[PDB]
């Protein structure tokens, strides 16, 4: 029951490393997980050894090693998983994201939040389904008022204004308000010049957050150079003179 002999059987295991990993997981989950560093360095050296071969059986044996090293749960089958998610990012197949997300959440801590959410970010690239779907599920998932804020600020960077406004709605329903203002300005860039979106974003932002005439006069110049000349503009500019 010496961790010495355990690491020795692991690092002397030759031939196919599959009996290596199976007997390793057996003994390691049999006795205590004090060999943590041994199995960790072993997994890294094994990546050096087999990373040129098929990613099927070696990466499977490694994931098994990590989940079995996780006796119950621990702070390195997760932090190590965050590193694992970073490696399992040049995928070519999103099953890596799906399965690794579980390694990130082998608990439910500050860990793998910033591994999944930027993973949704690199999911939003040319397919907005995972972006907006993870946005919805995370807004209605493990509670944190900052995650949905980050979701609005993430959909702010991709061309789906509905996802930004959706996270904004969720958070305002239940910095975050200022970030909603930033996303409102981002979708209020002068592209939809029908003169509706920027004005309504001004009203919603200046409703959830209070600026003393600053953003008010910003929206004033916007809507008054976007206003008309008839009764509509007469009344709009009069109302702005009065308010």
């Amino acid at each position: 029951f010496s961790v010495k002999c355990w690491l020795r059987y692991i690092e002397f295991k030759q031939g196919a490393p599959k009996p290596r990993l199976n007997q390793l997981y057996e003994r390691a989950l049999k006795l205590l997980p004090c060999s943590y560093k041994l199995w960790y360095r072993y997994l890294k050296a094994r990546r050096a050894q087999v990373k040129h071969r098929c990613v099927t059986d070696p990466a499977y044996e490694d994931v098994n090693n990590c989940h079995e090293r996780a006796f119950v749960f621990m702070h390195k089958m997760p932090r190590l998983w965050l590193d694992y998610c970073q490696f399992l990012m040049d995928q070519g197949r999103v099953t890596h994201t799906r399965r690794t997300f579980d390694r990130a959440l082998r608990a439910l801590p500050i860990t793998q939040h910033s591994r999944i959410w930027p993973l949704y970010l690199r999911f939003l690239r040319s397919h907005p389904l995972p972006e907006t779907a993870v946005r919805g599920y995370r807004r209605f998932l493990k509670l944190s008022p900052e995650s949905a804020e980050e979701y609005i600020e993430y959909l702010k960077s991709s061309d789906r204004l509905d996802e930004a406004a959706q996270r904004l709605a969720t958070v305002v329903n239940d910095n975050y308000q200022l970030w909603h203002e930033l996303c409102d300005l981002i979708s209020q860039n002068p592209d939809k010049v029908q003169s509706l979106n920027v004005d309504a974003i001004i009203r919603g932002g200046l409703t959830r957050f209070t600026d003393q005439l600053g953003k008010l006069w910003c929206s004033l110049a916007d809507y008054y150079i976007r206003s008309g000349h008839f009764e509509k503009a007469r009344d709009v500019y009069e109302e702005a003179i009065r308010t």
């Binding site: 990993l21 997981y25 989950l29 099927t56 059986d57 499977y60 044996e61 490694d62 994931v63 098994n64 090693n65 990590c66 989940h67 079995e68 996780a70 119950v72 749960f73 089958m77 399965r99 579980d102 390694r103 959440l105 082998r106 608990a107 439910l108 493990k142 509905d162 406004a165």
Partner: protein, 461 residues
Amino acid sequence: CEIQGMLDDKGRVIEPRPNLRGESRTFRVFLDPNQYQQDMTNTIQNGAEDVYETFNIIMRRFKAVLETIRNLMNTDCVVPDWLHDIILGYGDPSSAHYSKMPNQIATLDFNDTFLSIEHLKASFPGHNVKVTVEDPALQIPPFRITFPVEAKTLIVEPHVIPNRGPYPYNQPKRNTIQFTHTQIEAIRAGMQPGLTMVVGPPGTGKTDVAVQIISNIYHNFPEQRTLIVTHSNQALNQLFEKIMALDIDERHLLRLGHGEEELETEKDFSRYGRVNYVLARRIELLEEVKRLQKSLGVPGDASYTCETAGYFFLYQVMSRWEEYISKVKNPDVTEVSTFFPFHEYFANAPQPIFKGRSYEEDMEIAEGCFRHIKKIFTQLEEFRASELLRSGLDRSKYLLVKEAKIIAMTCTHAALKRHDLVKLGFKYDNILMEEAAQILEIETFIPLLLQNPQDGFSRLK
């Protein structure tokens, strides 16, 4: 005056009335939501005389409609582009159906109506039934049924509803009544985008068609919502009685009413009784996850709640499950039996679920048991709202707006309490309704304002 009762010894309306001393009666009533609203309008805005307080006598054997008209008219009134035209008649009236909305279900779940694939081969009499594989000992599934847009083949492929663990109690519920051919076409014309009015002659089972629609919509959309609306309470009561034999969890069922109503079916869907039953089910999920924790073999002397239960599930059960995953998908019939620490958990269950002979069958069993403990943690996710909602009516609204995808409502009742429903979760992605001619045009269009548009477009499908 919708009377609750007369005066008693303690001046309260009846609900065994007390010792009725004398021949006077002073009874309170409440006719409708907008009962003290027309007289309010007359006394406040038109300054005219009193109607509800000029009383003379009482005799035995509306404004809610007018308020609904005012609201629906002065809101955006953005209707579904396939039903506003079919409501104003302008536009070819064969258009609101499936064959004229472009996004037909490519392949939907035609599961319930068919329980024998030969029965389905008969019930598809004008399409070339293209059933995938040719063992009739292998084909009676909840098949996938693509009808294409050659162009008339019923593309039926087998499917296998995934496991739920070792236990033979949750044998997933499939229908029993082999509804008609045009009736299955009714179910499909309802479950695909558009409009559908079923001409149900006496005895044909329009309510059976409705139960089929509930089932098929809960199949082909796990997330979108179903408003099942009636003219009288008979529809909702009978359709609940019928769906009591389908694949619905009682965390997905709820209703509305017009005030006081006594439960017409077997089990309560009502507000307080439902919150109480779901509290009992939450106890079930808590004790389940906790005995599963003892199966995992950790120490600890006090018990936890919903939040810690979900986090602990993802922390322990998911970790062990990733271990078993990286042992099984990295994998012998020996390890598909052994390498699951669910031996102490399914040690309160029938004989070991990994049969030790067929590795893939043992895999189905193991993933079904893990997903069953995940459904324990998932009903814990649902009881998050039961533990976050403070009151009985509060938890009713929370559990109907959040998870209950099937809300059964009455016509005048929902026309009266639509605003509260809009504000606290009126989700109308699909409508299933009964007693069609038993309503009016008003009681058919007043529900059309249960919401506000979604970036210039309505919630209807």
